[PDB]
Swiss-Prot record, chain B:
This is Catalase-peroxidase 2. Its cofactor is heme b. Binds 1 heme b (iron(II)-protoporphyrin IX) group per subunit. GO terms for cellular component: cytosol. Gene3D superfamilies: 1.10.520.10, Peroxidase, domain 2 (1.10.420.10). InterPro entries: Catalase_peroxidase, Haem_peroxidase, Haem_peroxidase_sf, Peroxidases_AS, Peroxidases_heam-ligand_BS. One of its GO terms (molecular function) is catalase activity. The record marks 75 as: Transition state stabilizer. Formation of the three residue Trp-Tyr-Met cross-link is important for the catalase, but not the peroxidase activity of the enzyme.
Length: 714, 710
């Protein structure tokens, strides 16, 4: 049978498994070497040369359309990066997770198992020097280039994952190719990048399977927006992409294709969708169930897509695979395209409902008209959009490796300016820490501010962090959670210190506000530990710079705004999920393990760095003194808990005997004494000789978070 | 909502998560610090003194019955150790996993959340010096001692787990307290230690809820047998345990108790079964004490059971229970809380089972004839029950460990001789390689010796050379005929060496087996062009039949052996699932398992010397050939005709039949995660890494039962 899962018995059980993924690096790789180093040893041009040859080296087990695999590889790359969501930065091509379930078996990724299989020889040849992640995007680039279109650039550095990302919530649906996320097109439930479970963006036949182009445009626009693309970028990508290849639907996929990869027999060795007539038959190939090319020359860059779409009238019909597609009302395009495999046959172009959407929608139409009138403009926008699409989850320019990285840095890379001054030394670091502690700022204020600065980092797409001090810029400076009013006060004091420090130097040395914010936080934690009798020294890495509005796409940073913040015990009154679930989801972005999260929160409550300075979870009589009081008091059976009257997130801790109110807290605090696993960690920290251990573990986790975006140490 | 799992989309997806548990050590504890060292610092007597006081220190949130928590702690300890299964060694008290789901929420563990909570202050007071696992058993011991019965002994050493054991298959049922595992009592499906999902062993009311004691006895006998206990031990444990306390069922549990811990509100802070309404406690739904003095060791249970006639009835909680016919026992027991109230003794269907079943009755009559005999059968059975998953005697720690070692500990003799040195080792290795034994014979034999180890209960392993004794020497998988040949040759080497020595130095056959294996692996590596030096730990001893309970070792027999590509024809689960299950027992991660099998196939050490999975034309040469050829798209795979787990690999262009393989070999090229690992080892410049990873894993397995080093 099956060893069953606690998840099955209790559907609402905290999914700590997502944090366990941060406790180790699954896979055979040794944790002594970084991929960046290995990639640097790669002869990129040699790999591209091999990719070039592969493009026209048809393998019989999966015949190349028109004798060129290029279009297939472009789709592969498109789908690899296409799962990206701006909401949490998850999905995307950075880990090459298209290779693992569930993505590897999504209907929208049908036959991409074969595409990836074609690249295996090249992958084996270069080994660790090139990740599957980097290889898949490079294959897409070489494809495009070999078909007459120079790409804007390419960067390597994507480290391969060895399993799926367990933290990604792909939707509520209990079945692929079905949707329970939108009633009206354009109103998809927030936090999802697609309109249908198992699809990249939208249904190619139209919303809910109805060939309604106008409605389709609403979903296309919303989904692409959730994938960081605007109208011009979306139109450029779709049009540029569909300028190549064709759709496959020789027959109905629901009855002519075998089980997806995950459900396929062991002998298929990782492949899926076995065609009843044999995969070898190019003329019987089935993928989406839709059939036909978009242009007359499917393997050459040109204006064929835009011209076919705009210059002709189209009608909705049922294709050979039984799916909705569009045919031209004219007879000028009849059999105007050669058959993908039969040298003695021809085909007629077709358009997807989603293609017609670009022509029917007013705004998209304006863009397409402009593109048709200005080929160079079309090319320019597609080149930049393709580069963006394939690199948006790689983080800052510091992480872009290789000889093909453009000199130009794009705004979506959240670029950082150079430090035109000498860095502070050890003596200055000690000096500044003392000066910060000697100001009117409290330990709580300093800890709260440093956390506000670093807490925006997310390991999914490497965006956020303390470097740049974007906390002082829009929109962060005005985020409710950051307490704008209070924030300005703290930053003013730190700015004055910066001013006085810089003016007193005579050697060219300067300190950034970004560093002082973190340095003040470290000093505060050290002081808190000192008040408890412990002497700890937090390692500090100077060099963070102060980014300006010119380096910041303000609107794009709103996605990093936390709805729940554990360190500050902040809970937005709009959250749907239980507070603890959001807490775990956010902890994952900071690469925290269950134990680290526990030490962080429990240690923090001893210091007391709450939003609006509440006493929620602050189970101690000596605030700003780092101890294990949180755990000792949380575990005291002398206290009985209950939801607070007329409160949405408040709970009261009452003396079991007297009935007196001893403490107040939220689910963020109480989850550590409720969840079976977290309670086990709490018991360790709440024991008699575990205070020093908690202090050190807290300090280690604090330091870890403060340095998350310092890729220079990576 | 919440993120769905691949498990939900694909129910039959390989559960590699069980192997991932061997990769990292969740929990806040350092990876270096070892528990044995910390327990050594503990003042055991001080802990017992505190537990002694706790027994009569009633806490308002869970008032002690009869003013003594002893019985409750006994039940807590019995349930902690009670989930053990000999089949895989899983379950049991060694990790204190009663603290985590699903066990912490099984209906049979109702209100033990409170029992464990009572121990929290002591746990906090002593910290890392005593694990929850050790403390729960110690609490049971102190309870028994405080109520007038001396225990046989106690050993510390149980390292706390920080999560549930994902490798345990608790059963096929989709609902607690239901059973889809037996059609006739005494015929429960293989591999399960209980007759019902969510219960420790059996239904207290009777099989399928029918109060039939003769039938109940059949399930009691089979389940306890699956937990390593025979008739005398079973009767002694039940009678001894029920000499204490009572069952709680003031009203029906189905409508009077709140949700189990895992489903309880956050404010309950880990507790569950909150009563929705002198002791109105409700646990099992059955109500009443077994004896007149529930907090005193005596013959009350046995006398009440055997000296009176009993009849079944529905108690106040709506459950089956038995009442005595005589009015002599009516109101003979004080109420657990209401001092001005009395109660009549009761028996469970499972207790009446000990009287109605012919064989159990004979045992009980014997117990009643001599309390001293009953007492010691119970003392020894309680010790066994609570220590059977702790491994050999070397792992038993503390001042209360008995000088006497029991056969279930799989004891080992002392080495009454001087250990061999580096020169002797080098010499012996050469001697082995100079014999007519092949690289394959040596690797296979060393694997056969070491592969029986299981991390679940720490049984098995190469120490003791039990491979040469019954029943292992005759297991089909070990190829008896071939094994004898190897052992004979190695035995002659041992004899010659031991005689040649003059300073009293000797070498065990146990060590020669492993040394031979290592030498062979080092040779296989050398054939491929690699110089590897496998570390060797001399000191394994040769156990004899007197240190071996032969029938108990059959539980360690493999149904599937990946290294030897052996698959029993009676397996129910897919071979790859058994492979993963067995890999977990060897503490292997997915990558280690992958390196082990792949590397092993280049060496070629298959059962019956088949070419299954041996994707290389250079056998006994350690390379990454397995992966290179497995991943070659030039080859197409198909199921072998009329085969069970066999496949054929054909060249796609030439039609040449290149290879033969099993699901064991092919899963590494099919499963999404394993294939990613395979691609790494099958890469152009990864052969050296594969060789090293294989060697490291081989060495790891050979040393699994070397606790002396732990
Ligand atoms: C509104 C978004 C889109 C939808 C609904 C969509 C749709 C689809 C469908 C249904 C197929 C055919 C699969 C098959 O049967 O073989 C296909 C393929 C293709 N798509 Fe798109 N697509 C979109 C966007 C994009 C983008 C942004 C790119 C790349 C810049 C790309 C490029 C391709 C290429 C090159 C092919 C042809 C593959 C081949 O010849 O095998 N697509 N698409
Ligand atoms: C498979 C055979 C057995 C069955 C069916 C069984 C059943 C039960 C049930 C139904 C309860 C009452 C739970 C409650 O309502 O509070 C109980 C309690 C008890 N059991 Fe057993 N049991 C068995 C074996 C054992 C063994 C082997 C021992 C220990 C040597 C033990 C010791 C206890 C103790 C001392 C209590 C009383 C708890 C208290 O007073 O709170 N039991 N059992």
């Amino acid at each position: 049978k099956r060893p069953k899962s606690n998840q099955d018995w209790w559907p609402s059980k905290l999914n700590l498994e997502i944090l366990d993924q941060n406790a180790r690096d699954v896979g055979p790789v040794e944790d002594d070497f970084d991929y960046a180093e290995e990639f640097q040893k790669l002869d990129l041009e040699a790999v591209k040369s091999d990719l070039e040859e592969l493009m026209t080296s048809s393998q019989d087990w999966w015949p190349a359309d028109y004798g060129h695999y290029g279009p297939l590889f472009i789709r592969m790359a498109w789908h690899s990066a296409g799962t990206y969501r701006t909401a949490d930065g998850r999905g995307g091509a950075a880990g090459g997770r298209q290779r693992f379930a569930p993505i590897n078996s999504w209907p929208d990724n049908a036959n991409l198992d074969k595409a990836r299989r074609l690249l295996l020889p090249i992958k084996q040849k270069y080994g660790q020097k090139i990740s599957w992640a980097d290889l898949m995007i490079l294959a897409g680039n070489v494809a495009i280039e070999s078909m007459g279109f120079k790409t804007f650039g390419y960067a390597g550095g994507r480290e391969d994952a060895f399993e799926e990302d367990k933290a990604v919530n792909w939707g509520p649906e209990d079945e692929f190719e079905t949707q329970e996320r939108f009633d009206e097109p354009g109103e998809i439930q927030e936090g999802l990048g697609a309109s249908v479970m198992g699809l990249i963006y939208v249904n190619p036949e139209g919303p809910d399977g109805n060939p309604d182009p106008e409605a389709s445009a609403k979903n296309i626009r919303q989904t692409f927006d959730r994938m960081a693309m605007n109208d011009k970028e979306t139109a450029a990508l779709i049009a540029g992409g569909h300028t190549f290849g064709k759709v496959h639907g020789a027959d109905d996929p629901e009855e002519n294709l075998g089980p997806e990869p995950e459900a396929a027999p062991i002998e298929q060795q990782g492949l899926g969708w076995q065609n009843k007539n044999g995969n070898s038959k190019g003329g019987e190939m089935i993928t989406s169930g839709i059939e036909g090319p978009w242009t007359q020359s499917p393997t050459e860059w040109d204006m064929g897509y835009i011209n076919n779409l705009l210059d002709y009238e189209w009608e909705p019909e049922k294709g050979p695979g039984g799916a909705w597609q569009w045919a031209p009302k004219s007879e000028e395009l009849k059999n105007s395209v050669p058959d993908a495999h039969d040298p003695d046959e021809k085909q007629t172009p077709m358009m997807l409902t989603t293609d017609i959407a670009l022509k029917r929608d007013p705004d998209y139409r304006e863009v397409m008209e402009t593109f048709q009138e200005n080929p160079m403009e079309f090319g320019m926008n597609f080149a930049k959009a393709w580069y963006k699409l394939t690199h948006l989850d790689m983080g800052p320019p510091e992480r872009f490796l290789g000889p093909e990285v453009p000199d130009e840095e794009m705004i979506w890379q959240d670029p950082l300016p150079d430090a035109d001054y000498d860095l502070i030394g050890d003596e200055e670091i000690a000096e500044l820490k003392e000066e910060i502690l000697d100001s009117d700022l409290s330990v709580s204020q300093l800890v709260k501010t440093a956390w506000a600065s670093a807490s925006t980092y997310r390991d999914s797409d490497k965006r956020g962090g303390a470097n740049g001090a974007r906390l002082r810029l829009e929109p962060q400076k005005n985020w409710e959670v950051n307490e704008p009013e209070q924030l300005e006060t703290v930053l003013g004091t730190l700015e004055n210190i910066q001013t006085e420090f810089n003016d007193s130097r005579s050697d060219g040395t300067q300190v950034s506000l970004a560093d002082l914010i973190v340095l003040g936080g470290n000093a505060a934690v050290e002081q808190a530990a000192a008040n408890a009798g412990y002497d700890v020294e937090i390692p500090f890495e100077p060099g963070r710079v102060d980014a300006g509005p010119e380096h910041t796409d303000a609107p794009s940073f709103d996605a990093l705004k936390p709805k729940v913040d554990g360190v500050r015990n902040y809970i937005q009154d709009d959250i749907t999920r239980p507070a603890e679930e959001v807490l775990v989801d956010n902890a994952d972005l900071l690469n925290l393990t269950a134990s680290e999260l526990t030490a962080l929160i429990g240690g923090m409550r001893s210091i007391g760095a709450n939003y609006q300075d509440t006493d929620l979870g602050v189970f101690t009589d000596e605030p700003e003194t780092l101890t294990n009081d949180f755990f000792v008091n949380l575990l005291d059976m002398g206290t009985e808990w209950e939801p607070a009257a007329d409160s949405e997130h408040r709970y009261k801790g009452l003396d079991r005997d007297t009935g007196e109110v001893k403490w107040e807290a939220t689910r963020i605090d109480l989850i550590f004494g409720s969840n079976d696993r977290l309670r086990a960690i709490s018991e360790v920290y709440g024991s008699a000789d575990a205070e020093k251990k908690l202090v050190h573990d807290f300090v280690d986790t604090w330091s870890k978070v403060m340095k998350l975006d310092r890729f220079d140490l990576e």
